[PDB]
């Protein structure tokens, strides 16, 4: 009954895709057309069949015969899965692009264990505001189903996730290729008594839409519609928008030194009128008394009592980043482009306060001379044009960012705090 959105993460050779494949195959969620067409080949052995079937599923997807999601039902939930791109350039698309994941599955191979990548996958899970993790220690066959390897990799995977504020999460020894503990309970690991993966998915807590939080709607586009008037289009991220509400747009209002605000007359989602819009609804809405020229992409709507927080050029904010890639080294004065929600603005690195240990979360060097690829750090940034951002502990949806420069994704970040200057 409840819908949960899950994102699979991990090193792209550690089996996460195969894990998703195994979930569909062993729950019987393969198209009948594929299964019948395989039967024409006669006996090929179990392994050949699973590989052939997953290859046939990929081809159907690519031909447009669900393309971008894997979907299946469990006893207590509808599950939608995303298999996350591993190449670091797509991180901006993850941070800025579509829906809230409710849970992450981080798949880590028993063989290689924790990789240089893995801390990035963890940090990314937090940055996206994902409440629940499930850990999978995969390829247990390649290490002879051994408990003492599972426990090591579990322990070190636990430090990365613990440092980020995850705890009491499942850690499941699996083999995706053979099936162990994905949907079928293993016989090879009697030492393990926790849930199988599909059991863990079923037990993800039902999501609470952030309706208690201040209204925030980042604006994607802005139209003048003949006979109705000014129509912003955006997704409500937090709070609720009801017909008749007054909303204000930032940083429009700060930039123009006046309220760019007015009354909400109607709301549409999928071309149907709504009386109220909730977190996750992608809506057009008619706001009276606001010019189409006074609002654009990257402005954010808010109620007048709790308006969106603007960080001006005169201000700065503190952030926690992971440096994903940089050809030399980041230093004070570095001036890349920050992308958050629907905004993008030039930013200035004003200070580098600390280098952080992603294994413990502790300051390892105050005031470093620079940072580079793979460093975790605490920086102070100054927007070179105003922007809406929120501290991540108040409004996580508007507290996440990506840094872009020279064509590539440099850093991902979280907004710790904002200092008015």
């Amino acid at each position: 009954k409840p819908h949960v959105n899950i994102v699979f993460i991990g090193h792209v050779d550690h089996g996460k895709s195969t894990t998703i494949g195994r979930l569909l195959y062993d729950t019987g969620n393969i198209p009948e057309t594929i299964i019948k067409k395989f039967e024409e080949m006669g006996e090929k052995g179990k392994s050949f069949k699973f590989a052939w079937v997953m290859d046939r599923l990929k081809e159907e997807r690519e031909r447009g015969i669900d393309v971008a999601h894997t979907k299946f039902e469990t006893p207590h939930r509808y599950i939608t899965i995303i298999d996350a791109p591993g190449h670091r350039d797509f991180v901006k698309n993850m941070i800025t692009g579509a829906s809230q994941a409710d849970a992450a599955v981080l798949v880590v191979a028993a063989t290689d264990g924790v990789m240089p990548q893995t801390k990035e996958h963890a940090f990314l899970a937090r940055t996206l505001g994902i409440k629940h993790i499930i850990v999978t220690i995969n390829k247990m066959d390649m290490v002879n189903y051994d408990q003492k390897v599972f426990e090591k990799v579990k322990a070190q995977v636990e430090k990365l996730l613990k440092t980020l504020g995850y705890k009491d999460f499942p850690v499941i020894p699996t083999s995706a290729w053979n099936g162990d503990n994905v949907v079928k309970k293993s016989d090879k690991m009697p030492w393990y008594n926790g849930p199988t993966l599909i059991e863990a998915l079923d037990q993800i807590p039902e999501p609470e839409k952030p309706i208690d939080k201040p209204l925030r709607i980042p604006i994607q586009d802005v139209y003048s519609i003949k006979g109705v008037g000014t129509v912003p289009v955006g997704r409500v991220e937090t709070g609720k928008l009801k017909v008749g509400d007054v909303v204000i747009f930032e940083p429009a209002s700060t930039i123009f030194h006046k309220p760019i605000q007015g009354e909400v007359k109607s709301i549409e989602m999928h071309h149907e009128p709504l009386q109220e819009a909730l977190p996750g609804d992608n809506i057009g809405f008619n706001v009276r008394g606001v010019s189409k020229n006074d609002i654009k992409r990257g402005d954010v709507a808010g109620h007048t009592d709790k308006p969106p927080t603007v960080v001006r050029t005169k201000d700065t904010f503190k952030a926690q980043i992971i440096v994903l890639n940089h050809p030399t080294a980041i230093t004070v004065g570095y001036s890349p482009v920050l992308h958050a929600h629907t905004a993008q603005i030039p930013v200035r690195f004003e200070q580098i306060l600390a280098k952080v240990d992603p294994r413990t979360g502790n300051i390892v060097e105050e005031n470093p001379q620079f940072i580079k690829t793979g460093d975790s750090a605490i920086v102070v940034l100054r927007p070179m044009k105003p922007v809406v951002l929120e501290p991540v502990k108040e409004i996580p949806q508007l507290g996440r960012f990506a840094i872009r420069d020279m064509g590539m994704t440099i850093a991902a970040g979280m907004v710790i705090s904002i200092q008015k200057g």
Binding site: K58, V67, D83, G86, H87, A98, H271, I283, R297
Partner: protein, 88 residues
Amino acid sequence: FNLVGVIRVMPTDPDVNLDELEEKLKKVIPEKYGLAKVEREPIAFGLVALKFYVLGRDEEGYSFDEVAEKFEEVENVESAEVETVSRI
């Protein structure tokens, strides 16, 4: 291919010919990308988005963001934004 990226294309106006626009957008996807399908998704007040399921590769040199820029140059396009990216 091993990556699908959903790119959401908004029209400049509710009266844009979406059959004409689809056809034009299809011609500017670069050769090394593919296309699984195009869906139409109504938004509000007669605006209908085109959602392109672009096929690519999970590697340096591939970017659905660059496909979206090619799309933003086409006549009657207001915006093109990458929604979902996911392996297949």
